[PDB]
């Protein structure tokens, strides 16, 4: 029982660390790509200008 419970310990801790870190950094990338999209917006804006 203690073997299996610490097995779930390791498995769930590793999976939660990976998933949450990827999620937070993927929202960081979300903001970054939104920023690049808005730079392309100002590029089209200056072409129109």
């Amino acid at each position: 029982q203690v073997e299996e419970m610490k097995t779930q310990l390791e498995e769930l801790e590793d999976e939660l660390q990976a998933a949450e870190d990827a999620k937070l950094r993927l929202e960081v990338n979300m903001q970054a790509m939104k920023s690049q999209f808005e730079r392309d917006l100002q590029a089209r804006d200056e072409q129109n200008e």
């Binding site: 990976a18 990827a22 950094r25 960081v28 903001q31 970054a32 920023s35």
Partner: protein
Amino acid sequence: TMFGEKLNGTDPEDVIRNAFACFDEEASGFIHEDHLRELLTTMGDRFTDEEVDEMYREAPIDKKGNFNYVEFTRILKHGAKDKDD
């Protein structure tokens, strides 16, 4: 498994590259030495700048204070190595 115990709390180059793109908008990798130390040693988990200096005396920092990251990311991963035997 003795390599397996050597890998934890790390991720491939993509996420580090994305983060380095995030923190400075220019993404040119001009991490100024004062800016680098301020962003690294000061906030977050408190640790000593003296042990932070291992990132200075060993890792190749670019001149005039700024610090490139793409070569740094490559050497952190298996992509690049400082020297060869």
